[PDB]
Design an enzyme around this catalytic site. Structure first.
Site, PDB file in Angstrom:
ATOM      1  N   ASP A   1      31.549  22.437  -2.094  1.00 51.14           N
ATOM      2  CA  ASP A   1      31.039  23.586  -1.349  1.00 51.14           C
ATOM      3  C   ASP A   1      29.705  24.112  -1.926  1.00 51.14           C
ATOM      4  OD1 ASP A   1      30.946  25.721   0.708  1.00 51.14           O
ATOM      5  OD2 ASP A   1      31.849  27.064  -0.764  1.00 51.14           O
TER       6      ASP A   1
ATOM      7  N   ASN B   1      27.350  23.669   3.989  1.00 51.93           N
ATOM      8  CA  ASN B   1      28.276  22.594   3.517  1.00 51.93           C
ATOM      9  C   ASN B   1      28.975  21.939   4.686  1.00 51.93           C
ATOM     10  OD1 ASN B   1      29.505  25.392   3.526  1.00 51.93           O
ATOM     11  ND2 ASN B   1      31.341  24.166   3.428  1.00 51.93           N
TER      12      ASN B   1
ATOM     13  N   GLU C   1      33.815  27.268   6.823  1.00 51.75           N
ATOM     14  CA  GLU C   1      35.186  27.340   6.303  1.00 51.75           C
ATOM     15  C   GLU C   1      36.267  27.259   7.419  1.00 51.75           C
ATOM     16  OE1 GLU C   1      32.716  29.004   4.136  1.00 51.75           O
ATOM     17  OE2 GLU C   1      32.924  26.887   3.689  1.00 51.75           O
TER      18      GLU C   1
HETATM   19  O1  LIG Z   1      29.895  27.880   5.115  1.00 50.96           O
HETATM   20  C1  LIG Z   1      30.183  29.094   5.891  1.00 50.96           C
HETATM   21  O2  LIG Z   1      29.482  29.215   7.047  1.00 50.96           O
HETATM   22  C2  LIG Z   1      29.901  30.350   5.016  1.00 50.96           C
HETATM   23  C3  LIG Z   1      29.670  31.634   5.515  1.00 50.96           C
HETATM   24  C4  LIG Z   1      29.433  32.696   4.547  1.00 50.96           C
HETATM   25  C5  LIG Z   1      29.124  34.046   5.213  1.00 50.96           C
HETATM   26  O3  LIG Z   1      29.022  33.917   6.499  1.00 50.96           O
HETATM   27  O4  LIG Z   1      28.919  35.104   4.531  1.00 50.96           O
HETATM   28  C6  LIG Z   1      29.478  32.393   3.127  1.00 50.96           C
HETATM   29  C7  LIG Z   1      29.757  31.034   2.749  1.00 50.96           C
HETATM   30  N1  LIG Z   1      29.943  30.095   3.699  1.00 50.96           N
HETATM   31  C8  LIG Z   1      29.822  30.519   1.389  1.00 50.96           C
HETATM   32  O5  LIG Z   1      30.059  29.109   1.080  1.00 50.96           O
HETATM   33  C9  LIG Z   1      29.592  31.431   0.380  1.00 50.96           C
HETATM   34  O6  LIG Z   1      29.379  30.826  -0.969  1.00 50.96           O
HETATM   35  C10 LIG Z   1      29.318  32.831   0.672  1.00 50.96           C
HETATM   36  C11 LIG Z   1      28.997  33.959  -0.184  1.00 50.96           C
HETATM   37  C12 LIG Z   1      28.856  35.042   0.660  1.00 50.96           C
HETATM   38  C13 LIG Z   1      28.511  36.465   0.259  1.00 50.96           C
HETATM   39  O7  LIG Z   1      27.669  37.078   0.964  1.00 50.96           O
HETATM   40  O8  LIG Z   1      28.889  36.971  -0.772  1.00 50.96           O
HETATM   41  N2  LIG Z   1      28.982  34.617   1.953  1.00 50.96           N
HETATM   42  C14 LIG Z   1      29.271  33.314   2.018  1.00 50.96           C
HETATM   43 CA   LIG Z   2      30.752  27.748   2.813  1.00 54.55          CA
END
Ligand SMILES: O=C(O)c1cc(C(=O)O)c2c(n1)C(=O)C(=O)c1cc(C(=O)O)[nH]c1-2
Ligand SMILES: [Ca+2]
Lengths: 71, 573
Positions: B303, B261, B177
């Site tokens: 995503d 992603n 992100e």
């Molecule tokens: O693409 C990124 O590196 C990244 C990092 C994280 C994270 O580090 O928890 C999430 C996401 N993306 C993501 O797309 C996502 O749906 C998500 C859900 C969560 C959570 O633990 O609830 N973390 C993350």
């Molecule tokens: Ca993500």
């Protein structure tokens, strides 16, 4: 763009109707700064160099030290 | 690691987040079973001393339970013979600026463990949000070594758990992100020396490919694709971070995980298939060289971060007993591959409402896209299923090998999405889309489902008020246990899905249950403490429904049911 029309194995991307084949010069030109783009890779080199110092120090002394200024 | 593998087969232990290298999350313990689980009571409890989301779960090895927190990622050990006393604690000193670059709360998916050997004493490993990998003495808590993996100044954090294989600990990445280009790193467990590092985009040397990469499935793509499926240098900030889970087959000596992603979310800014984001990898453990790589979601528009867990099994395919991986992706498809060759065995919809894809052509391996559900600049796409949160997210699921069923907590969340142009500046968010999320067409936000991954046959499906986020535990007592976002732990009969037990925890659950035997008795344990992406609205007091990357509006009701919390509950008969 259904994803099934392949220019080469593993390369099936096509522009959507009305959108451009290349973004450089289009209205969707991301116009990235080459210097910004390179920052992550330079940061990882610096981290890799500090870690190597900590590893060399551990091999020299048998004691782990994190802060590279204290080695 | 062969001793870790042996320790994983003892029911006194829970030695890794995934339970074992196949990520079965399946226990042979039967003391607690479908006919007496109604009598399950709280045995004892611990506080973690922090709030925010508590992902993963405790580890148990050699009669010690290990507990970890969200930022600042404190770790505690507890002797199971003296559950009130903390044997040791480790309290990291981290820059609080780390918090500002976490996209969705400051969750930490947990500890890993290696037994003593030539490398020295038994160790606990911790990934800190601030990007360090730390090795601790498992018996004393002493810090043995600490290395820098990820730089928070670049938006690069750690959230996924470390993973031990042989003499190496694997450390992933996080920050797609923020335009972080994903990489996974193996460190020698003795001294923390970096052994290899594989990137998810870019030149072949950076990808770390075997000379025979995808030789069994050349139509997946082979060489030069990390560059040729991007325009210019866009791959440099191209995402593909790996913050989810791994699996390992010691007979093949191969590690399996998914890359995340592509960045930014604005698809129109990054024409091309954007390889090798969204890819199921099979990599050689010693060298990191990929033997296969299957891109599930070319040119991601949604995503659908490809990081979900990998569950290994052996099942009959056209009458032949075959080594498989099964992987419920964010994109709403359940993939099953041959884990030796990488060949696609099946790819079926986890719920029939998935609409970005009409189906996967299994011969070509390509998802046939429905343009009605595409995203693109100058357009507000409506009614896309799944949403970016996926029909499956970070929960580690479970497999009953006798039934040949996977049990999964599923999300039922749809979205609208509109991108926008934006610049890349290192250390800033690089998302580029506005989302609104809401329940899918069946009307609720979650389900629990049992399914055969080879045939795609759904054994049973039950609704849940909220998305089931934390994953599941299955047992030979014919039970599957899981926690809910509204703060229950629940147990259902795995032959039918009938609800057999529930208990009201203090806070919502976003990690998985564990079970272990200690001194002849079976215990079930779980974290309580809501947060993570679903909980961002309540955690950060957000009200704009498009905030929290679109989660705030979908989960607006969650705060009527749960506050933040941070505890460990242990149950027994
Ligand atoms: O693409 C990124 O590196 C990244 C990092 C994280 C994270 O580090 O928890 C999430 C996401 N993306 C993501 O797309 C996502 O749906 C998500 C859900 C969560 C959570 O633990 O609830 N973390 C993350
Ligand atoms: Ca993500």
């Amino acid at each position: 763009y259904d994803g099934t029309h392949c220019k080469a194995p593993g390369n099936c991307w096509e522009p959507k109707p009305g959108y451009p084949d290349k973004v450089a010069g289009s209205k969707y030109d991301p116009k990235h700064d080459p210097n910004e783009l390179n920052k992550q890779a330079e940061s990882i080199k610096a981290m890799e160099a500090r870690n190597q110092k900590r590893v060399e120090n551990y091999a020299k002394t048998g004691k782990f030290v994190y802060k590279v200024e204290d080695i | 690691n062969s001793e870790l593998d042996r320790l994983s087969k003892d029911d006194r232990n829970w030695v890794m987040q995934t339970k074992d290298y196949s990520a079965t999350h399946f226990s042979r313990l039967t003391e607690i079973n479908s006919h007496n689980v109604k009598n399950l009571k709280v045995a004892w409890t611990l506080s973690t001393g922090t709030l925010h989301g508590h992902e993963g779960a405790p580890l148990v090895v050699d009669g010690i339970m290990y507990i970890h927190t969200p930022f600042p990622n404190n770790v505690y050990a507890v002797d199971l013979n003296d559950t009130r006393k903390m044997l040791w604690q480790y309290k990291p000193k981290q820059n609080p600026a780390a918090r500002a670059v976490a996209c969705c709360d400051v969750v930490n998916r947990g500890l890993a463990y290696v037994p003593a050997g030539e490398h020295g004493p038994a160790k606990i490993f911790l990934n800190q949000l601030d990007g360090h990998i730390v090795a601790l003495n498992a018996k004393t808590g002493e810090e043995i070594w600490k290395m820098e993996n990820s730089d928070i100044a670049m938006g690069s954090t750690l959230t996924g758990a470390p993973f031990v294989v042989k003499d190496k600990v694997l450390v992933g990445s996080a920050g797609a992100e923020l335009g972080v280009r994903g990489y996974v790193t193996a460190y020698n467990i003795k001294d923390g020396k970096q052994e290899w590092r594989a990137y998810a985009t870019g030149p072949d040397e950076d990808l770390l490919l075997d000379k025979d990469f995808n030789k069994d499935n050349p139509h997946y793509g082979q060489f030069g694709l990390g560059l040729s499926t991007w325009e210019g240098d866009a791959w440099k900030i191209g995402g593909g971070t790996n913050w989810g889970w791994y699996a390992y087959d010691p007979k093949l000596d191969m590690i399996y995980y998914g890359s995340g992603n592509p960045a930014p979310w604005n698809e129109t800014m990054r024409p091309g298939d954007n390889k090798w984001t969204m890819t199921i990898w099979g990599r050689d453990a010693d060298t990191g060289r990929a033997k296969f790589g299957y891109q599930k979601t070319p040119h991601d528009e949604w995503d659908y971060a490809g990081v979900n867990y990998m569950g290994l099994s052996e099942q009959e395919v056209d009458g032949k007993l075959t080594p498989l991986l099964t992987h419920p992706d964010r994109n709403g498809l359940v993939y099953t591959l041959n884990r030796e060759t990488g060949a696609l065995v099946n790819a079926f919809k986890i719920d029939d409402t998935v609409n970005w894809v009409k189906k996967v052509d299994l011969k070509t391996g390509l998802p046939i896209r429905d343009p009605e559900y595409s995203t693109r600049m100058d357009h507000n796409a409506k009614g896309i299923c799944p949403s970016a949160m996926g029909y499956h997210n970070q929960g580690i699921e479970s497999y009953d090998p006798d039934k040949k069923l996977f049990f999964m907590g599923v999300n039922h969340i749809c979205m609208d999405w509109e991108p926008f142009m934006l610049p890349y500046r290192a250390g800033q968010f690089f998302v580029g889309a506005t989302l609104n999320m809401y329940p899918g067409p069946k009307g609720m936000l979650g389900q629990v489902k049992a399914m055969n991954a080879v045939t795609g046959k759904m054994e049973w499906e039950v609704p849940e008020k909220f998305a089931v986020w934390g994953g599941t535990l299955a047992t030979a007592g014919d039970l599957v246990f899981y926690g809910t976002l509204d703060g229950f732990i629940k147990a259902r009969d795995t032959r039918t899905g009938e609800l057999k037990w529930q208990f009201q925890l203090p806070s919502g659950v976003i990690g998985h249950p564990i079970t272990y035997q200690h001194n002849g008795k079976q215990y079930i344990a779980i974290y309580s403490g809501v947060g993570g992406w679903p909980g961002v609205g309540l955690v950060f007091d957000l009200k704009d429904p498009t905030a929290g990357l679109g989660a705030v509006g979908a989960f607006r009701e969650l705060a009527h049911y749960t506050q933040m919390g941070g505890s460990v509950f242990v149950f027994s008969l």
